[PDB]
Short mmCIF file of N, CA and C and ligand atoms in Angstrom, two decimals:
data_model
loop_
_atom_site.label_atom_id
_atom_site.label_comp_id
_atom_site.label_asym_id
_atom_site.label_seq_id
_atom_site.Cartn_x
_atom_site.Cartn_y
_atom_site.Cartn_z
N UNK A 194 11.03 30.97 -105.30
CA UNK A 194 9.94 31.78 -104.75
C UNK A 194 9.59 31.23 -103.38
N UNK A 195 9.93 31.80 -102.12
CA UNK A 195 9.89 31.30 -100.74
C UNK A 195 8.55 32.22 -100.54
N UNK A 196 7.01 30.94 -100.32
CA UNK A 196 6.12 31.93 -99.73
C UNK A 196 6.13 31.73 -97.99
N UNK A 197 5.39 32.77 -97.32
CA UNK A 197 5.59 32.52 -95.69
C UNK A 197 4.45 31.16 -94.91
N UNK A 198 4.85 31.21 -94.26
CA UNK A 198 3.57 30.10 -93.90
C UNK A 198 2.69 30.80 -92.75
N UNK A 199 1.58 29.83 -93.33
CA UNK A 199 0.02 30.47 -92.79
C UNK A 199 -0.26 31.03 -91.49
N UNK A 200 -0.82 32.17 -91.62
CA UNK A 200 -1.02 32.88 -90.29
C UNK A 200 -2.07 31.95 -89.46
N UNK A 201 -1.82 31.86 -88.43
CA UNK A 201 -2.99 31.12 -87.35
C UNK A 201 -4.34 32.44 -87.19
N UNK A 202 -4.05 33.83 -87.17
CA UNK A 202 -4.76 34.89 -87.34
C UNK A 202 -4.55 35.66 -88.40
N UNK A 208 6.45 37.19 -91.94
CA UNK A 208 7.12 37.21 -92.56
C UNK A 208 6.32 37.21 -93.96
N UNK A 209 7.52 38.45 -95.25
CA UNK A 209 6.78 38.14 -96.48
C UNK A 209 6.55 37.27 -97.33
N UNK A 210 6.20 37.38 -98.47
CA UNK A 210 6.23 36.39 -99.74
C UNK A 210 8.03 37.31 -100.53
N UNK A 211 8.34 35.77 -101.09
CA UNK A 211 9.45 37.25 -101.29
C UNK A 211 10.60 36.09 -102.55
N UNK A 212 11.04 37.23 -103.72
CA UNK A 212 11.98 35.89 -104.44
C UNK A 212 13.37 36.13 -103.89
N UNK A 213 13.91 34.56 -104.09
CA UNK A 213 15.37 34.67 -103.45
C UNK A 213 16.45 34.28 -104.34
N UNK A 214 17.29 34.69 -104.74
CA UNK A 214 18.04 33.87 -105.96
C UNK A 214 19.50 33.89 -104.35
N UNK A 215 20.35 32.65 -104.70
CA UNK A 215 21.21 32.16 -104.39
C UNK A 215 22.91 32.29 -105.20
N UNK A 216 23.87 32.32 -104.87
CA UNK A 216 25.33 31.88 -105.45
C UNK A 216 25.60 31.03 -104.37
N UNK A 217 25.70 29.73 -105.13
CA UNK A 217 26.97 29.28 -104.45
C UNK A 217 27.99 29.40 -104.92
N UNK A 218 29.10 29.75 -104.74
CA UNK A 218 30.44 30.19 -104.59
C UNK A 218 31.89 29.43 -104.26
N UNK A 219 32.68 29.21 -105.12
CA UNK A 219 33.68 28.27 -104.63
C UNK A 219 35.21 29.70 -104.81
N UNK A 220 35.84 29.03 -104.00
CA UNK A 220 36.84 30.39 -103.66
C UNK A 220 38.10 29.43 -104.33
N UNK A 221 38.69 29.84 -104.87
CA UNK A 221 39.79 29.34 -105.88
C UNK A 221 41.36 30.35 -104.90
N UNK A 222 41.70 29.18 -104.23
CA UNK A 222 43.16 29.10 -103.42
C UNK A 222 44.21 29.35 -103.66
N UNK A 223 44.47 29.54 -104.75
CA UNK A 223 45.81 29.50 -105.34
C UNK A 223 46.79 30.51 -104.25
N UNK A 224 46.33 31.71 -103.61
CA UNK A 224 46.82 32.62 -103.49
C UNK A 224 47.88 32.30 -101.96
N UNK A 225 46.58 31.46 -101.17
CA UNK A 225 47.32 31.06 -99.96
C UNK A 225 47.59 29.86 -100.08
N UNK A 226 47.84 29.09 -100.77
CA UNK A 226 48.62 27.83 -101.31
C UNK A 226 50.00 28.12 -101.59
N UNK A 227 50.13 29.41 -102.25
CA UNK A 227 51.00 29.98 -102.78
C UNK A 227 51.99 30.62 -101.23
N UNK A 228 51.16 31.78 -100.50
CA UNK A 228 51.75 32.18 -99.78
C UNK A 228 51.69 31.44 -98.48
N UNK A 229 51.17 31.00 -98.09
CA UNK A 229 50.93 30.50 -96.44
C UNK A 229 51.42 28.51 -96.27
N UNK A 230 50.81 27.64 -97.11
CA UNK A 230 50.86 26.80 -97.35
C UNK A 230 52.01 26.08 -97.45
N UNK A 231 52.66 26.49 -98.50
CA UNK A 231 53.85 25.94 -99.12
C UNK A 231 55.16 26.27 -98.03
N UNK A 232 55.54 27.85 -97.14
CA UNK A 232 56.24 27.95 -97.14
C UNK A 232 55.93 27.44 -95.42
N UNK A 233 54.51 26.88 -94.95
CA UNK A 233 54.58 26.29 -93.91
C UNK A 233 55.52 24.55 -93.91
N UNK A 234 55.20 24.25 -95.11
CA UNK A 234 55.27 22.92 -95.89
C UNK A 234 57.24 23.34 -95.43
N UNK A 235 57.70 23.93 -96.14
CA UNK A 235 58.84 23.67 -95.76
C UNK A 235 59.67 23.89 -94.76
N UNK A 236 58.92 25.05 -93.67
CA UNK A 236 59.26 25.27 -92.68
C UNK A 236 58.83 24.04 -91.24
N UNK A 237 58.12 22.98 -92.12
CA UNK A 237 57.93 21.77 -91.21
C UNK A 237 59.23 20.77 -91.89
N UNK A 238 59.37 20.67 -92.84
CA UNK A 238 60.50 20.18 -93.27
C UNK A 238 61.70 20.39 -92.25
N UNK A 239 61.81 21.55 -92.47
CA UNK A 239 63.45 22.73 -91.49
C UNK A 239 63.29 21.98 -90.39
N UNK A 240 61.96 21.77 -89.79
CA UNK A 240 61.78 20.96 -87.80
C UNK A 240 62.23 19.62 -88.63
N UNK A 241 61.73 19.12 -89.05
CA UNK A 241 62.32 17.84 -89.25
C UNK A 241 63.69 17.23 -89.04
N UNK B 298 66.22 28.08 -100.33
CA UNK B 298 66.99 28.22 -98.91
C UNK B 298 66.51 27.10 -98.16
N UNK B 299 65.38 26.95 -98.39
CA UNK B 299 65.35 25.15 -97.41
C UNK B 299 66.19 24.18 -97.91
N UNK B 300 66.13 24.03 -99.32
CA UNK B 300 67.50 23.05 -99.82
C UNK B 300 69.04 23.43 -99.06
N UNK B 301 69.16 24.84 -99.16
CA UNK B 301 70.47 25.01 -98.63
C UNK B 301 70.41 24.18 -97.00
N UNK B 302 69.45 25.18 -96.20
CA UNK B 302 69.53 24.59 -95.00
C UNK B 302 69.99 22.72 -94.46
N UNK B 303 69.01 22.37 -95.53
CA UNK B 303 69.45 20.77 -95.45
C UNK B 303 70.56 20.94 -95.73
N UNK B 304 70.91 21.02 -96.53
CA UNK B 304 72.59 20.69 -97.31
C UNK B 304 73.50 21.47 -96.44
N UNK B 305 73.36 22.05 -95.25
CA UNK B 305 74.05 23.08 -94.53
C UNK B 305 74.47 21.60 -93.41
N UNK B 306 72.81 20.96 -93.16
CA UNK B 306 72.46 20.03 -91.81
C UNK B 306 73.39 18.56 -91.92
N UNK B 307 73.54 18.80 -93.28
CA UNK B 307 74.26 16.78 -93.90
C UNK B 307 75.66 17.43 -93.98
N UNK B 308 75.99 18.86 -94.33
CA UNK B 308 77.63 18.90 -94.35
C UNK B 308 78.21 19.23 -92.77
N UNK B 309 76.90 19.39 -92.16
CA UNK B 309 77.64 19.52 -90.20
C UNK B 309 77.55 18.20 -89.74
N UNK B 310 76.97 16.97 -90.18
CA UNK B 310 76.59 16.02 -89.75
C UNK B 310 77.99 15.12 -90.19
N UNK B 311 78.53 15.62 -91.25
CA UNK B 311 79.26 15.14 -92.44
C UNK B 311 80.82 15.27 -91.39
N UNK B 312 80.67 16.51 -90.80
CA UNK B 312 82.23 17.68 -90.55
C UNK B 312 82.30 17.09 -89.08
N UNK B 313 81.10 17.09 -87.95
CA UNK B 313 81.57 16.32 -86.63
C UNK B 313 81.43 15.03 -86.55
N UNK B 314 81.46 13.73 -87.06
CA UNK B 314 81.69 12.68 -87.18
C UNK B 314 83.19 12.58 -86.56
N UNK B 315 82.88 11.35 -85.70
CA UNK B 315 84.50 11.04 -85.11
C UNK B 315 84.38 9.28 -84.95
N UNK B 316 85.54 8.99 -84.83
CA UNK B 316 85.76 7.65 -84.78
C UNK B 316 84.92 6.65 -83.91
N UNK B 317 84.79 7.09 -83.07
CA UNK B 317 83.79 6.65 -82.01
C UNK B 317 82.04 6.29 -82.35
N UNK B 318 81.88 7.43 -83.24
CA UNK B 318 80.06 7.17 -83.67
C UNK B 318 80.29 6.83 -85.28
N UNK B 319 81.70 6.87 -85.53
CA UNK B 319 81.02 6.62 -87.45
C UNK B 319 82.62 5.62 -87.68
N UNK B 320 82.29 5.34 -89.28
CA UNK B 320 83.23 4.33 -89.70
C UNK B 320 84.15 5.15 -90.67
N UNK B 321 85.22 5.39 -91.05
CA UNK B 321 85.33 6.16 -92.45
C UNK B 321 85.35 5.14 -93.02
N UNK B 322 84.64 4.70 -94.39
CA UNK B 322 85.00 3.83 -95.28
C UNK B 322 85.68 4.38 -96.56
N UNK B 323 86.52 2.89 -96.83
CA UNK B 323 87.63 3.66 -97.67
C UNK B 323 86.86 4.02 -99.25
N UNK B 324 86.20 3.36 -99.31
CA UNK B 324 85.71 4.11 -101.02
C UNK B 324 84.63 5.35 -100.54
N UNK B 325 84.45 6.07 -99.65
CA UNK B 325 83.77 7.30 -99.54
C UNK B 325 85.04 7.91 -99.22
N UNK B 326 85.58 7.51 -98.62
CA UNK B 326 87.30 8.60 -98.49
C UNK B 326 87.77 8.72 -99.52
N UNK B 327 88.03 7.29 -100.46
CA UNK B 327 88.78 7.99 -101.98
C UNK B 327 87.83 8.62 -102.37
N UNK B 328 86.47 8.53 -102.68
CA UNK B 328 85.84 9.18 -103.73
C UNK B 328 86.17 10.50 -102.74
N UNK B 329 85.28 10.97 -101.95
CA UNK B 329 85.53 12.29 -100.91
C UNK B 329 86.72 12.93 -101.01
N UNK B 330 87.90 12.46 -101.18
CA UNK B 330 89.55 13.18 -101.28
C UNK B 330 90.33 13.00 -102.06
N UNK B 331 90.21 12.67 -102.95
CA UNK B 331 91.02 12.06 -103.83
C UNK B 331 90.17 12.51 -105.76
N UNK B 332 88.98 12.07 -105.40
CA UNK B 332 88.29 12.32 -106.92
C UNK B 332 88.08 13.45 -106.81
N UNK B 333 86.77 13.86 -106.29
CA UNK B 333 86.19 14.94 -106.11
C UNK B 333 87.01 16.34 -106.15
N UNK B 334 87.92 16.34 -105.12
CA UNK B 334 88.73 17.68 -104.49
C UNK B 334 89.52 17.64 -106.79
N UNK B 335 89.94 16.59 -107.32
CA UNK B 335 90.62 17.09 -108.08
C UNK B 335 89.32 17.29 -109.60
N UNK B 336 87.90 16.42 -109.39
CA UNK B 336 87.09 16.94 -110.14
C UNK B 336 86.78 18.62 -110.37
N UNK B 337 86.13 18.60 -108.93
CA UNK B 337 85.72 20.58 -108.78
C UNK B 337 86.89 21.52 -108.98
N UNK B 338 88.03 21.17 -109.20
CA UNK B 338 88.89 21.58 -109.52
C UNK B 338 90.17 20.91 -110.18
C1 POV C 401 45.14 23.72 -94.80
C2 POV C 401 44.95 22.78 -95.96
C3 POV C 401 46.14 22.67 -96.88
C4 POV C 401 45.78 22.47 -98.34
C5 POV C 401 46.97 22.15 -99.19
C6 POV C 401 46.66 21.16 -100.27
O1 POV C 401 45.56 20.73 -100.48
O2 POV C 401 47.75 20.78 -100.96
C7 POV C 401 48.09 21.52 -102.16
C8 POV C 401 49.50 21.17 -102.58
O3 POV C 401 50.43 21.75 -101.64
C9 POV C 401 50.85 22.99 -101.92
O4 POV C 401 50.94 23.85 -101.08
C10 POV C 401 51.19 23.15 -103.37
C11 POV C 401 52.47 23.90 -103.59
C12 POV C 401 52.24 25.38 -103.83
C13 POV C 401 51.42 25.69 -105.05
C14 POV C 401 52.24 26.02 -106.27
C15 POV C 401 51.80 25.30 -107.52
C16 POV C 401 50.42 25.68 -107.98
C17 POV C 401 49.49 24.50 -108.17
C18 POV C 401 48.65 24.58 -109.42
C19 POV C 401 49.37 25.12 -110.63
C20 POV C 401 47.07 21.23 -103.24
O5 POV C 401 47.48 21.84 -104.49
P1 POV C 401 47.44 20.96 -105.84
O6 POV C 401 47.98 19.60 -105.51
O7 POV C 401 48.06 21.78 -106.94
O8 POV C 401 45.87 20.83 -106.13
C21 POV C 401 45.03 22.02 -106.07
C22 POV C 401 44.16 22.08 -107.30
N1 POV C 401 44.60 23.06 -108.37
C23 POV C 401 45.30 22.34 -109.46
C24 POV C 401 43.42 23.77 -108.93
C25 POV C 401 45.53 24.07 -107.78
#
């Protein structure tokens, strides 16, 4: 519950939050790995 | 295909070798011509 602060002469208001974690697999999979071996190939 | 590539990079490395930069030694020559060629076949 975020209230505003005091007027000398914004609302009161509820806030709910997600934090959020993003699960990688996808560009691990595509981007990652085949950078991984394409630094290998320079090698 | 990256495995191949290597294995492409060690059999060119393998094929221009000359007397001058490498040694042939004789137990990689027998094994190399002699075993092998009559193993894989
Ligand atoms: C820019 C930052 C780069 C991040 C890469 C990194 O952290 O390394 C990655 C490896 O390296 C890879 O790319 C893993 C190989 C591909 C994934 C295939 C197996 C799936 C892993 C799972 C089946 C990290 O991947 P990890 O070591 O598997 O750890 C991740 C955690 N996990 C188990 C939830 C997946």
């Amino acid at each position: 519950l975020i209230q505003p602060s005091v007027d000398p002469r914004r609302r009161e208001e509820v806030t709910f939050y997600l934090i959020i974690r993003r699960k990688p697999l996808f560009y691990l999979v595509n981007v990652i790995a085949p950078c991984i071996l394409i630094t290998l190939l320079a090698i | 295909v990256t495995m191949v590539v290597v294995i492409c990079v060690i059999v060119l490395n393998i094929h221009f070798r000359t007397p001058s930069t490498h040694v042939l030694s004789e137990p990689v020559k027998k094994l190399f011509l002699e075993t092998l060629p009559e193993i894989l076949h």
